[PDB]
Structures are given as C-alpha cells and as structure tokens.
Amino acid sequence: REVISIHVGQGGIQVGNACWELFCLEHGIQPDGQMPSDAFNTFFSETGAGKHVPRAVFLDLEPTVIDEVRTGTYRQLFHPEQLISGKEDAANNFARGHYTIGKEIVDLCLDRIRKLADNCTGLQGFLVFNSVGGGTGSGLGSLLLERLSVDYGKKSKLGFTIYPSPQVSTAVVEPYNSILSTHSLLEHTDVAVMLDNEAIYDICRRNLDIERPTYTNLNRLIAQVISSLTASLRFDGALNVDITEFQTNLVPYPRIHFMLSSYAPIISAEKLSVAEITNSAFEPANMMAKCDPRHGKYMACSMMYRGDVVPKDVNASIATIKTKRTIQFVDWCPTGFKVGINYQPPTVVPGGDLAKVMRAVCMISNSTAIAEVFSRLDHKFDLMYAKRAFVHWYVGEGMEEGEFSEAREDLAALEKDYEEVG
Amino acid sequence: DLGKKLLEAARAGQDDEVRILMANGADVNATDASGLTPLHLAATYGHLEIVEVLLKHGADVNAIDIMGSTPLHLAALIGHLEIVEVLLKHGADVNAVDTWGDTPLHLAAIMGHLEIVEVLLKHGAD
Amino acid sequence: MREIVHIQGGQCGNQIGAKFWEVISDEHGIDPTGTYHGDSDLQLERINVYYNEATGGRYVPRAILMDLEPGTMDSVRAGPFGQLFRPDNFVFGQTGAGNNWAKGHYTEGAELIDSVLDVVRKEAEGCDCLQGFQITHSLGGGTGSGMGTLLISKVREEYPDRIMETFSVVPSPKVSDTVVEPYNATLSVHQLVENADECMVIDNEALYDICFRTLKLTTPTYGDLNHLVSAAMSGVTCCLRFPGQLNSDLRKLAVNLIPFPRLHFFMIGFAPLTSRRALTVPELTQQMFDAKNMMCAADPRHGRYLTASALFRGRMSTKEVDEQMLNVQNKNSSYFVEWIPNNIKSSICDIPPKGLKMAVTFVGNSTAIQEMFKRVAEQFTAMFRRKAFLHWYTGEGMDEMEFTEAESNMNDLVSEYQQYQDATA
Ligand SMILES: Nc1nc2c(ncn2[C@@H]2O[C@H](COP(=O)(O)OP(=O)(O)OP(=O)(O)O)[C@@H](O)[C@H]2O)c(=O)[nH]1
Ligand SMILES: Nc1nc2c(ncn2[C@@H]2O[C@H](COP(=O)(O)OP(=O)(O)OP(=O)(O)O)[C@@H](O)[C@H]2O)c(=O)[nH]1
Ligand SMILES: [Mg+2]
Ligand SMILES: [Mg+2]
C-alpha cells in the first residue's frame, strides 16, 4: 500500500521540507536515511544498504528552492533523480505553468513519478502539495493532476493546498491563479485540505505570539496537521487508514470535497485536558482556514487524537458538545462524525515553535463555512476580470480567455452548492 | 522663376543668392503654394540677415499664409529671439491669431521660449 | 530567470548608463578592474544578473555601448569604470544623427545596426537563462531615440519571448530648447508602445524642477540631472540585483505592474532626494508619494494608481513599514483604483545605497502620467501643424503619415489612461 508525494512550486516544496523533516523524526530516520531500530514503508522505500528514502518528487520551474534541498540538511536523504528543476519560472502566471513552460518538463516529471511507482508493490494513491497563488504549483500542478488522472486512473489523489493571504502576497494576480487552480482541484482531486495562509499566519501571530512570522513558522504548524492527518497511513490505526477512506468518510457529494482542518492545543514553547482541547478544535482561532464553522453546517467531521487520550473522556466531551447545539450537522447526511486515537503524543521538532504536549487533536471536516474563503477570492477575481485586468498575460501564454469564465462559473456552482447544503 | 528661387534661398539661408535675386527683380513677396513668403521661410529657419534685408525691401511683415500664420508666429514657435524683435520693430502684429486660434505668445509659451514670451508681453501681447 | 543584457545608446543613453554602472558596481563591491572587494555575500549572490564572470575572477558588465558619434563613448572610455567595459562591445559610427530620429532609425543608424546586433546576439546567446534587455536612451535626440527604437524592433523580432525594458529620458524645453525634440519623442513613444514591455520614465522636466526648486540649483548641469537618474535606476533595479521575492525579475515585475499591455510607462518616486540625519519610515512613505519626489512631471494626485510597489532599502523594521504602508494607503485612498484588490505592495532590501542608511523607491503605474504625454503632444501638435523642419525627416525617406500614426497612437494612450482613471467598481 505505498503513497507517493508530489511537491510542486515553492509553497509545495517548502511545506514538503517541513513534513519530511517531521516524518523522519517520527519514524526515527536520520537525514542520512539510516534507521537504527510494515506501516512506514507506505511513505519510504528501503535500499539494500539500509537507506530509507521518501517516496517523493520535488518539482519546480526554477532551481533556487530545489537547490536548497540538494545542498541542505537532507541532501543525503533524496535521490537526485527525485529533485527536478527548470531554468525560468512561471512568473506568477498559471498559464505559463500549465501551458507554455510546464509542457516542456511534464514528461520528465511523469517519468520520475513512474520510477517511484515501479518500486511500489501496491501503489494506492498520491499526495499533491502546492500553492494556488503562484504560477508553478497552480499551473504545472494542475497539468500534472490531469495527466495522473489518465496514467493512474484507479488511484486516489489528496491535495494539501495552500491558499493566499495580502499579508504574504507578492503578486496581484493571486485571485486569478487561485480560481484556475480550484477549478482543477474540483475535477482532479478526491479530497483537498485547505491550508489558508490568512488563517495560519494569524495563528502564528496570535496563538504563537510571533510578531511577523516566517514561512518556516507557518510550515512547521502545517506539518503537524499533515502528520496528524496521515498518522493512520504510516502507523497502525483505525480511522482514515488509506487515502480512499478520506473520501468515503468526508465526502458525501463528489465535488464538495474541500476540507476545513484545525489543531489543538496551539501553544508556544514559553512556559490542556481532552475536554479542553476538544472544545478548542471547534474554535475559529484554531482553524487552518479563515471562517466561522458556527455559521455553517458540517457534512462530515473526523477527530484524530494523539497521545494520552482515554476513549471514555473523548466520548464525554463530544456528548457535552452535542448538547451545546452550536455545532450542527446536516440532517440525514450520508457522512458524519468519526473519532480515532493514536496513543503516541505529537513529536517535538528541534528549534520549533510549538510546545511539547502530552495530548493533541487534529480535526478534518467538511463544513459549509469554507465557502467564505472562496467567496472572498471570487470577489477579488470579479473586480479585476470585469476590466480584463492582467488577462492578456494568460492569453499570451497559451490559455484561451474562455477558461477564465469556465473556472469562475465552476466556483459559482460550488458556492451555490454550499448555500443549498446549509 | 525668380520668386520661387528667392523662396528657396531664403529657406536655405543663402544670403548671397538672396541679394542677387533681389537685384535681378525677384518678387520679395512671392508666395509658395500655401501662401508662405520669403520672410516666412527665413523667419522659420533662423536667417536673421535675410529677414532684415527682406524687411528693408518691401516685405509685408504681417503676411499670412493660408493657415493665418504670420512670420512672427513662426519665429516665436521656432525660438528665434533676435528675429522676433526685428519683426516687432517693423510693425509685426503682436496679437495676430491664426486659424488654430494661436497667437505668437501662445506658441512661444507652449515650446518654452521664455525670453520670447517676456518680449511679446512687453510689446502688449494678450 | 538570470542574466540581463544592457544597451546604452546615444549621448544621453551612454551618460546615464555610465553612471548606472558606477553606482551599482560600488553597491556590488566591484572595482574598475572588475575585482570584488566587500563584506556581504548578498553582493555577489545575483551579480550574474548584470555581470559576466571572466577567467581572471573579474566581473565584466554585460553591456553594449552604441552611438553614431564617437565622442561620448570616448569620454566613457576615459571615465572611472571605462576600462571595465568589454572593448569589443563598443559600436560607434563617425557621422552623428543630428538630432534627427530619421537618421537614427532609417539611414545612418540602419547602416550600423547589424554591427550592434552582432554584439547583442553574442551576449544574449552566452546567457544560461536570459531574462531580457535593458535599454538606456533619450527620446528627444536622434541616435538614442531613432536608432535605439530600431534596435528595440530588431531585438524584439529575434527574442520575442524575452522581456524588453527601457530607461527612457523624455525631453523638456527647460533642459534643451531644441524644437524637433517633440517629433523625435512622439515617434519613439509610438515605437515604445508597440515593442517594449516596461518603460521606466525619466522626465527632464521633472529633473529640472527638482534641481531648481527643491535642491535650489539655479542652472542644473547634466551631472546634476544624472545624479537623480542614477539614484532612481539603482533603486528601481535593487529588486533584480539582490536576493528577494517581490519583483525579483523583469517578468514578475511586469505581471505585477501592467494590467493592460499598452500602459507600461511607470512613474518613479524616491526619497531622500540628494545633491552630489536618516529619514524615518513615516518620512520615506510620505515623500516617496510626493509630486516633488517623482521622476515624471505629472501630478500623482491628478490620477489613480492601477498598481505600485514600494522598495525600501536599509536596516528598518518590517512592522513599521507595514504600519506606515497602511497609513499612506488610507490617506491616499483617492489616488488608487478600487477594482484591483491589494494593488500596492512593499518589500525591504537590507543593502542601502551609498551614503544612506534609509531609502525608498516607489514604482507605480498611474493614470496621471497622461499629463506628461499631453505636454509632449501639445508641442508636437504646435510644430506639426506648421510643418516646421518636416523635410528633415521626409528627406531621409520617412513618410509624413508616420508622424500622424505616432501622434494618433499617443493620443489613444492618453484616452486609455483617462478611461481607467474614470472607471468604477
Ligand atoms: N504556507 C506557505 N506558503 C507559501 C510558501 N512559499 C510560498 N507560499 C505561498 O504560495 C503562494 C506563492 O506561490 P509560490 O508557491 O511561491 O509560487 P510557485 O509555485 O513557485 O510558482 P512561480 O514562482 O510563479 O513559478 C503565495 O500564496 C505564498 O504565500 C511557504 O513556504 N509556505
Ligand atoms: N537627463 C539627461 N538628459 C540628457 C543627457 N544628455 C542629453 N540629454 C537629453 O537628451 C536629448 C538629446 O538627445 P541625445 O542623447 O543628446 O542625442 P543622441 O541620442 O546622442 O542623438 P544625436 O546626437 O542626434 O545623434 C535632450 O533632451 C537632452 O536634454 C544626460 O546626460 N542626462
Ligand atoms: Mg516559484
Ligand atoms: Mg549625440
């Protein structure tokens, strides 16, 4: 049952850098690939010489970010064939990544992915890491999704997808790339987890009291969420044990598959109970996407506890929350609430920001409230598109103007979908 | 045709050719196809001595071409200060208006010829 | 995206170009022999953007020097860094263009353009990954204006996928009372609208006013004007020459600044202004926006910004820049369009310019620049209606209809600025 991770563009690669750092620490793998002391083989191959190698490719249209991997702490961990770089990037232009520039490297990318799959006894699916606000993660990422849907037709695809914020933005065209990407994700992923930089940045500023956070701060928090959500893939567990179970547990209607996640407790290393962390998991302040899940309804909710967590205490906290009635599920929905406990507590990253804790919880849910995130980006899109601002940059890089309205319409349909479910 | 030779010598600054043509009877007030005179052309291209010799020999200082341009308009547009002053000395109309509604002052101001602007104002430009 | 190929053309082009290379070589630690001396490794991280590395360990500007007259390049050779330019990258004629855009674009310039293109190709083909071209020239003369735009056309044909950027000096009677300059500049703006991606406007009207009124210099020499130009050029190019993310290459700069392909003429403000105590961040953010600090004689409060970037330089707080950027956007909310979300962005470069600890360069796409085009258009129209010196241009084979075509293209540009200035959300 192996899982192959695909990391595209800067955001996808640097979140990948944080995830693989934590995966190695959790499985006791050194940056050398050695393991001094089965489940973790879903994410790592093993060589004759005892090297444990991530089942992953890092893909970018420029070499800067990839070079830092090639020369950094984990230069011995990846095979060089796993690390692919172009010469000129997509310049924040979805069209460049998807058409004129991405077309020249996608076959090379699919051959390196095919080398990974050829070393899989029973490949079960892909994890695809990228941002939507740039040009490479958005455009080459979507092109790779289209090709993987044709070449690996029977394999599930789960996105870990970074959405943009004004606070860490270098491109005015982010709303365009965001909508074009989301149109791709609607058709070519089974599940997508929204990593909204607006919310994550604010958590670092507030809960972690970091005055102006770095990508490393944001990424180390993201890695703890992604580690919690993939814990059942890499260890023996009983909830979300394969990629396909994410769809079955979380997705009652095929295209409504964008997930709101949370983590508790989120506390700084300077200087709580099952009931307390369970309440915190339903609070806006702990959500990885900027919305109020009290204003919406839940189609699905999976709670994945980690550490010193007694099942009776989980049941009591949930009982109490149900009586409080602020948290509402869609009546008769074919999905719902599920709970899982892994009895290992979260792993501490050296030099991280998060305090060591004996128990934690990570929620992944399907909530109508996530429409707020799309609605804000759709409004920004609409203001610019009404004047066709910047559109020529996309049309000149191989995209037909019709793809703008197609994507927007897809997003309009998704927004109405959330409204009707509510 | 001596008139047309005079037009061309005034335009080209050929001082000796001007004097010879004028001495052989050339029409000092000849016009080209659009009504430009030898004084218009010498004023435009900056030939002060030809401007003065034409004015001494019956040139109409306020001739207009078919667009209403006077020699003073053209001198103020191109920036010839000493020519502007000579034309004024010989009675150029400081407030002549062409078919575009411009005066010599407006053209000098547009082109940034500040000394000419001041001279035109001292001579009563409106 | 890595290397940029620079071409400086004509007297203005070569004088402002020489100062550019002096100023950035100092910033990068390069001496006139091409040898690096400096502390920060930030100085060499993106040195390849403007410099080739020679065998000797020395750094050589990726620069081509072009003129139809040998004079200014001879004095460039004698200038401070003159011995660092590749000798075989000097391409000069003997004739001159006589301030005549036709001689530069169709006759004398046409006779020399293949020798220029030879050197340009050699530099372009030697690049690992070419970003594009940087052209420094005046629009009011003949060579920089007419032959510069010829070169832009020829390179655009051979390199249609690379970015074409210019530092274009716009004429003003305050600096040069030469009445064909509006012809030459209007003909050039026509070329620039069709064949350049990015035009960094340098208005001699604005430089003259700054030197006269704010710096109290009664009679500004070319040296005084060019002191401002080189400060702007260093500040505008800082984002390409030092590590960073915002506008870090020519194509990303273009995608952020240009919503509509023809409207690619930028207003540049910078602070502090200096002649040849550190400012606070509130002082930088206020001044960078001020008409008195702009390189374009257009009042930014007479139009709206489509987009802009503020590039701060020096040891200053990200927190404080955030705070003041919020303040200046609130106070100037009437001068930004409402239908482009987060259209003003900022960054900080740790390396400050020479003699300063705090500085900023503001680069914007403002509809107010139409005021500058209207000024030139009025002069063009005054001359063209009286057909003054037109034979100088048709005598070199140019059609009068090119005058009307350029005039009309620049009038449509003005119209389009006004369309987006009045647009509503
Ligand atoms: N959370 C997080 N977001 C990032 C990181 N790096 C970039 N981003 C976000 O990703 C978006 C910018 O896109 P990038 O991923 O940098 O662009 P790219 O995929 O490399 O594509 P091009 O550079 O345009 O070729 C913005 O929303 C950024 O905030 C990161 O390390 N962590
Ligand atoms: N700011 C600035 N403007 C200059 C400089 N040199 C010339 N100019 C301006 O540029 C215009 C004249 O163009 P030039 O560069 O001198 O002409 P050229 O390109 O060498 O063309 P020809 O001499 O006609 O062959 C006028 O507007 C001058 O004011 C300079 O060093 N700095
Ligand atoms: Mg990138
Ligand atoms: Mg010259």
- DSSP annotation of A341 reads E
Task: Mark whether C278 and C240 lie in a shared domain.
Answer: no
Give the Cα separation of A339 and A361 in Å (integer).
Answer: 10
C-alpha atoms less than 13 angstroms from C-alpha of C95 in its C-beta half-sphere: 15
C391 within some domain: no
Closest CA to A118 of A83, A85, A81: A81
Number of domains observed in the structure of chain C: 2
C179 within some domain: yes
Cβ atoms A5, A58 nearer than 8 A = no
- CA-to-CA separations, C412 to C337, C373, C419, in angstroms, rounded: 20, 11, 10
- CA-to-CA separations, C161 to A397, C132, C133, in angstroms, rounded: 10, 9, 11
Q: Which residues are within 8 A (CB) of A259 and not within 5 positions of it... i.e. 6 or more apart?
A: A191, A192, A193, A194, A250, A364, A365, A366, A370
Q: Which residues are within 8 A (CB) of C401 and not within 5 positions of it... i.e. 6 or more apart?
A: none
Chain C residues with CB under 8 Å of A392 CB are 260-261
Q: How far is CA A380 from the centre of its chain?
A: 23
Cβ atoms A163, A133 nearer than 8 A = yes
Widest Cα–Cα separation across chain A: 62
Which ligand gives the minimal distance to the CA of A130? 1
One-letter amino acid at A249 equals N
Q: Taking the domains of chain B in order of start, what are their residue ranges?
A: 1-126
Q: Taking the domains of chain A in order of start, what are their residue ranges?
A: 2-258, 259-372
Cα-Cα end-to-end distance for chain B: 40
Task: Tell me which chains share at least 3 CB pairs under 8 Å with chain C.
Answer: A, B
Instruction: Give domain A259-372's CATH superfamily.
Output: Tubulin/FtsZ, C-terminal domain (3.30.1330.20)
Cβ atoms C315, C350 nearer than 8 A = yes
Cα-Cα end-to-end distance for chain C: 35
Resolution in A: 1.8
Task: Mark whether C124 and C164 lie in a shared domain.
Answer: yes
Give the Cα separation of A261 and C258 in Å (integer).
Answer: 37
Length of chain A measured in residues? 422
Closest CA to A235 of A53, A52, A41: A41
C309 to chain B, closest Cα gap in Å: 34
One-letter amino acid at C239 equals C
Q: Residue A340 belongs to what H/E stretch?
A: strand A337-342
Ligand 2 center from residue C264 Cα (angstroms): 22
Could you tell me the two tokens for A124?
């079960």
C395 to chain B, closest Cα gap in Å: 14
Could you tell me the two tokens for C121?
């190709």
Burial of A189 (0-12, 13-18, 19+ CB in 10 A): buried
Which of A168, A390, A397 to mutate: most C Cβ within 10 Å? A390
Question: Is A161 strand, coil or helix?
Answer: strand
Burial string for A201-221 (b: 16+ CB within 10 Å, else e) reads: bbbbeebbebeebebebbbbb
List, by residue number, the catalytic residues of A: 245
In chain A, which residues touch C (CB < 8 A)?
A: 62, 87-89, 91-93, 166, 169-173, 175, 211-212, 379-380, 383-384, 386-390, 392-393
Q: What is the DSSP string of C307-349?
A: EEEEEEEES--HHHHHHHHHHHHHHTGGGB-SSSTT-EEEEEE
Residue in chain C nearest B100 by alpha carbon:
C385
Burial of C416 (0-12, 13-18, 19+ CB in 10 A): middle
Burial string for C325-337 (b: 16+ CB within 10 Å, else e) reads: beebbeebeebbb
Give the Cα separation of A173 and B122 in Å (integer).
Answer: 58
C396 within some domain: no
One-letter amino acid at C91 equals V
Residue in chain A nearest C321 by alpha carbon:
A212
C416 within some domain: no
- DSSP annotation of A175 reads H
Within 378-407 of C, beta carbons closer than 8 Å to B belong to 378-379, 382-383, 385-386, 388
Q: How far is CA C96 from the centre of its chain?
A: 23
Cβ atoms C191, C405 nearer than 8 A = no
Cβ atoms C122, C87 nearer than 8 A = no
Give the Cα separation of A160 and C14 in Å (integer).
Answer: 52
Q: What is the DSSP string of A201-245?
A: HHHHHHTT--SS--HHHHHHHHHHHHHHHTHHHHS--SSS-SHHH
Closest CA to C180 of C96, C102, C296: C102
Pick the CATH number of A2-258 from 3.90.1150.10, 3.10.20.30, 3.40.50.1440, 3.40.190.10: 3.40.50.1440
C-alpha atoms less than 13 angstroms from C-alpha of B34 in its C-beta half-sphere: 12
Question: Is C216 strand, coil or helix?
Answer: coil
Closest CA to A183 of A378, A14, A372: A378
Rg (CA), chain C: 20
Task: Mark whether C166 and C303 lie in a shared domain.
Answer: no
Give the Cα separation of B66 and C406 in Å (integer).
Answer: 26
Burial of A334 (0-12, 13-18, 19+ CB in 10 A): exposed
CB-based neighbours (< 5 A) of ligand 3, an ion:
A 10, 89
Give the Cα separation of C6 and A362 in Å (integer).
Answer: 54
Cβ atoms C64, C6 nearer than 8 A = yes
Burial of A36 (0-12, 13-18, 19+ CB in 10 A): exposed
C410 within some domain: no
Enumerate long-range contacts of C48-53, CB under 8 Å, 24 or more apart: C48/C2, C48/C3, C48/C128, C49/C2, C49/C3, C49/C4, C49/C131, C49/C240, C49/C241, C50/C4, C50/C6, C50/C24, C50/C241, C52/C126
Cβ distance of C339 and A380 shorter than 8 Å: no
Cα-Cα end-to-end distance for chain A: 37
Which ligand gives the minimal distance to the CA of C251? 1
The answer to whether C216 faces chain B, any CB pair under 8 Å, is no
Q: How many CB atoms lie within 10 A of CB C348?
A: 17
Cβ atoms C166, C264 nearer than 8 A = no
Q: Pocket around ligand 1: residues whose beta carbon is below 6 Å from it?
A: A 9-11, 14-15, 61, 89-92, 131, 133-137, 162, 164, 168, 197, 215, 218-219
Give the Cα separation of C166 and C144 in Å (integer).
Answer: 11
What is the DSSP pairing of strand C63-67 with strand C3-9? Answer: parallel
C153 within some domain: yes
Burial of A52 (0-12, 13-18, 19+ CB in 10 A): buried
Closest CA to A180 of A290, A288, A291, A102: A102
Burial of C56 (0-12, 13-18, 19+ CB in 10 A): exposed
Instruction: Provide φ and ψ at A398, rounded to 5°.
Output: 95, 5
One-letter amino acid at C107 equals T
Q: Residue C403 belongs to what H/E stretch?
A: helix C400-422
Per DSSP, helices labelled H in A281-324 are 311-324
Cβ distance of C423 and A91 shorter than 8 Å: no
Q: Which domain holds residue C272?
A: 267-370
Question: Is A328 strand, coil or helix?
Answer: coil
Q: What is the DSSP string of chain B?
A: -HHHHHHHHHHHT-HHHHHHHHHTT--TT---TTS--HHHHHHHHT-HHHHHHHHTTT--TT---TT---HHHHHHHHT-HHHHHHHHHTT--TT---TTS--HHHHHHHTT-HHHHHHHHHTT--
Question: Is A167 strand, coil or helix?
Answer: helix
Task: Mark whether C283 and C349 lie in a shared domain.
Answer: yes
CATH number of residue C63's parent domain? 3.40.50.1440
Q: Closest partner residue to B113 among C172, C177, C383, by Cβ?
A: C177
Enumerate long-range contacts of A313-318, CB under 8 Å, 24 or more apart: A313/A273, A313/A274, A313/A275, A314/A274, A314/A278, A314/A339, A314/A341, A316/A275, A317/A274, A317/A275, A317/A278, A317/A279, A318/A278
- CA-to-CA separations, A161 to A13, A259, A260, C335, in angstroms, rounded: 12, 10, 11, 35
One-letter amino acid at C253 equals L
C-alpha atoms less than 13 angstroms from C-alpha of C415 in its C-beta half-sphere: 6
Give the Cα separation of C231 and C250 in Å (integer).
Answer: 19
Positive or negative: CA dihedral A46, A51, A52, A56: negative
Could you tell me the two tokens for A29?
């793998």
One-letter amino acid at C26 equals D
A221 to chain C, closest Cα gap in Å: 22
One-letter amino acid at A192 equals A
Task: Mark whether C119 and C253 lie in a shared domain.
Answer: yes
Q: Whose CA is nearest to atom 6 of ligand 1?
A: A11
Length of chain B measured in residues? 126
- CA-to-CA separations, A151 to A130, A185, A246, B72, C357, in angstroms, rounded: 20, 17, 22, 82, 57
